[PDB]
Design a protein around this ligand. Structure first.
Ligand SMILES: NC(=O)c1ccc[n+]([C@@H]2O[C@H](COP(=O)([O-])OP(=O)(O)OC[C@H]3O[C@@H](n4cnc5c(N)ncnc54)[C@H](O)[C@@H]3O)[C@@H](O)[C@H]2O)c1
Ligand SMILES: NC(=O)c1ccc[n+]([C@@H]2O[C@H](COP(=O)([O-])OP(=O)(O)OC[C@H]3O[C@@H](n4cnc5c(N)ncnc54)[C@H](O)[C@@H]3O)[C@@H](O)[C@H]2O)c1
Ligand SMILES: [Zn+2]
Ligand SMILES: [Zn+2]
Lengths: 308, 308
């Protein structure tokens, strides 16, 4: 069991989920898929005054006020107070909704994150950045609310679909190319099946030191791909995978990355089978990044002439 | 203008509203009554990049999600970001809605509270407590959001009704009897119209020095009166006025208040027309309070039945 610390709360827990002892009532919030796979795993180890379950339907489209209201109403129905706890058993969609629901319920109550997806373990459960989607855009209504404790177990990752798993892997490389050169070297040489525990541990420490601009590597182009397709074609991690390549073309054109650096990142994406032919944040090196702003339109078009 | 400092965050500005020059876009939120009385007063001395007004209907029944959604949507319509500002021009209902809307919009933006009611100038302004009402109860969904600046002008208080003004005095006496002996003696010997500024200044200081139990003096009984009457007959200050007297009956029976001290508070409420006939936290003399939790039911029932 590995315990990464932050500033100056709280405590992340890598490894098997331990026996959680609580002296107050707890509300578990999960999705339709996770509740039929990993809810027996949590309720086997949970001890509290009263435990009730609220289930949101699986999907990004359910990340709204309607589901947020349901989480709040379930907390009101079992009469939760200022000493109560909310438990998030799911991906980034669940953890953001529960964290925002707990922040506004009785002006702020404790909540615990137990991420199931690879992306949520390496990014979403860390930081306290919570929110919901609105008709005006994604994640524009939210709050900064830090969880009491984060529990990361590799057992939840085994039930994930390979396409959803690889989408999380593309997000790990994204953080590696901009922050940690040592994580790149691990992904280049070592097989992920043999060092999954070591990869996440390094990925969490990146986000722990972060908690910012830099995690948006391949997001400016990746957002544009999802807005043109639309969200019917690619998963978020797949769109960033193409977005990183588009960002690498702009970084090579501006003289930020060398030809060998451009190939090195693209070879690592090829190693994990993350090349997808379709159809602002750029690296200054393998393990570093720079913020580019005032870039000529013709330089962008020259990069956009690659499609790809 | 006099400038009371809280601790580090923000400054109160007690007196005539000065020129507010801003380098960011601003959204003013007011109610139907205040907008037709005091909105021009603010607009003439406000300078910003863009100024738009959102008006909610006057009343306690409009303190909900429906009005909160409108405040957020108006901010989205004029394209407000994390640098933008919200302006609250109204009573405690407006300030709580705007403060909660600003706390969730782009995960937290700056907001300036300009209270118009006497209640909001002495209680709702300083604290950071924001929120809205739900079908499950009042002020159960909210957040702790500190304002950028508070502006208290006595010019807004002149348009208030007699009933609304005297109900705001009930909270001043509440804070005086439990914290400041000198403020009790000021209210007893001086006319309020002669030292209204000095009374507010001391009321802000008490609220500032506390920030907590003790501000709920007459709230335990006052909530029971409001729930029995279905929030129909009395205002919040009027129900607390009876609640303070009910608390005075329990404090007199325990020996916490002398008969002379008991009559002093009753005559103070009589001076501000706060006697309304019947049909935890009690004052320890004048200027002090005590938390009583283990009071026998027989004593509480003897306080009921309307004597003393
Ligand atoms: N700062 C932050 O907190 C931050 C950072 C990154 C992402 N996010 C947010 O997180 C969201 C993305 O999260 P995500 O990638 O987890 O998507 P997701 O939560 O929607 O999960 C993807 C799908 O996988 C399924 N799933 C989850 N766990 C499973 C399990 N263990 N076994 C089988 N299937 C499982 C879910 O049903 C879901 O439909 C985005 O909406 C984004 O806004 C927030
Ligand atoms: N901790 C806190 O922030 C805190 C403290 C006290 C009260 N509150 C909240 O505030 C609410 C009570 O506030 P309130 O007493 O101001 O009620 P209110 O905001 O509804 O104001 C009373 C009425 O007077 C009118 N009015 C306001 N300003 C006026 C003006 N200058 N001239 C003429 N009319 C005017 C309004 O239209 C309103 O209908 C409660 O619902 C409570 O939840 C919060
Ligand atoms: Zn992301
Ligand atoms: Zn009130």
């Amino acid at each position: 069991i590995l315990i990464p610390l932050k500033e100056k709360n709280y405590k992340v827990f890598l490894g098997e989920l331990p026996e959680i002892k609580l002296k107050q009532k707890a509300l578990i919030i999960s999705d339709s898929i996770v509740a039929g796979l990993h809810l027996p795993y949590l309720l086997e180890r949970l001890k509290a005054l009263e435990v009730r379950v609220c289930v949101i339907e699986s999907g990004e489209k359910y990340k709204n006020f309607h589901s947020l209201e349901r989480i709040l109403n379930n907390a009101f129905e079992m009469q939760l107070n200022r000493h109560s706890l909310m438990i998030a058993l799911g991906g980034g969609v669940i953890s953001d909704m529960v964290g925002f629901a707990s922040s506004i319920y009785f002006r702020g109550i404790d909540f615990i994150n137990i991420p199931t997806t690879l992306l949520a373990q390496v990014d979403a459960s860390v930081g306290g950045k919570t929110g919901i989607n609105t008709p005006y855009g994604k994640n524009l209504i939210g709050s900064f609310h830090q969880p009491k404790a984060v529990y990361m177990d590799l057992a939840f990752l085994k039930t994930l679909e390979k396409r959803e798993f690889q989408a999380g892997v593309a997000e790990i490389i994204k953080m590696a190319v901009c922050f940690d050169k040592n994580l790149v070297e691990r992904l280049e040489t070592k097989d992920l099946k043999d060092c999954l525990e070591e990869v996440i541990f390094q990925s969490v420490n990146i986000k722990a030191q972060v908690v910012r601009a830099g995690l948006n590597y391949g997001h400016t182009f990746g957002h544009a791909i999802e807005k043109e397709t639309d969200y019917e074609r690619f998963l978020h991690g797949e769109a960033i995978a193409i977005g990183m390549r588009m960002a690498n073309d702009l970084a090579l054109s501006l003289g930020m990355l060398t030809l060998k650096e451009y190939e090195r990142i693209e070879n690592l994406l090829k190693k994990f089978d993350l090349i997808f032919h379709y159809k602002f944040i750029l690296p200054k090196g393998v393990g570093a990044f720079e913020v580019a702003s005032h870039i000529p339109k013709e330089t962008i078009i020259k990069v956009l002439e690659k499609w790809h």
